[PDB]
């Protein structure tokens, strides 16, 4: 969260929060009333956005559901869709949070190391998160799209 990030710097430098830091801590809460329904709409699509994203990514990269593919089979497809649901949940947790904290601390710091022994294509995950970012804004208005696009940009900016 924003408060967690600010208190981290303050405790690291051994000092109280700053005069420009409380201005940001207060501005993080005043838009919380608007942002609460923003993730709520994305929250109430959770088993639909990823379901329609499966056909959007597996049709694009057809080698993920082929004999030489990592997601070959019904139960192997299920794991990929469950991963998409996990990342959607984490990105919603971050959009109801502020800074990168919920995604980066839980399911972002070491995805390369997880896949190091797991064999799941990072360049395919890039297009998966791109698709998720593209299929989740349309439920929102452009006013909410401005408050949604950067929050989705971080996944495909970090894994890269």
């Amino acid at each position: 969260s924003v408060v967690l990030t600010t208190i981290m710097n303050a405790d690291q430098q051994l000092r109280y929060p700053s005069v420009g830091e409380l201005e940001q801590i207060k501005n993080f809460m005043e838009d919380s009333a608007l942002r609460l329904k923003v993730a709520k709409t994305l929250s109430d699509a959770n088993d639909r956005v990823v379901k329609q994203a499966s056909a959007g990514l597996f049709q694009r990269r057809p080698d993920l559901n082929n004999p030489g593919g990592n997601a070959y089979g019904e139960k192997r497809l299920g794991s990929c869709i469950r991963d998409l649901g996990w990342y959607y949940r984490l990105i919603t947790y971050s959009i109801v949070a502020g800074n990168n904290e919920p995604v980066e601390r839980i399911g972002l710091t070491g995805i390369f190391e997880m896949y190091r022994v797991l064999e799941v294509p990072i360049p395919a995950m890039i297009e998966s998160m791109r698709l998720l970012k593209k299929e989740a804004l349309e439920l929102l208005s452009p006013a909410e799209a401005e408050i949604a696009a950067p929050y989705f940009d971080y996944v495909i900016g970090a894994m890269q």
Partner: protein, 68 residues
């Protein structure tokens, strides 16, 4: 002049270091009084916990003999 004898564990949760990280995740070492505060703060900042602290070296009276 006195060294606290303590034991503690400190997990690194942001880098996943990949070589000989077992001697750096649980230790007992004599630490001086003048450096004990800054050393003990590091464990709490990293996220580990101190298991025990023992004064060892000196007496709790202090006064003369504190300097070193």
């Amino acid at each position: 002049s006195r060294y606290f004898k303590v034991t503690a564990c400190i997990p690194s949760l942001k880098r996943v270091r990949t070589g000989r990280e077992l001697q750096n995740t649980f230790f007992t070492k004599l630490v001086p009084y003048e450096n004990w505060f800054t050393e003990q703060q590091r464990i709490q900042k990293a996220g580990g916990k101190v298991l025990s602290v023992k004064l060892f070296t000196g007496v709790q009276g202090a006064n003369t003999g504190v300097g070193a």
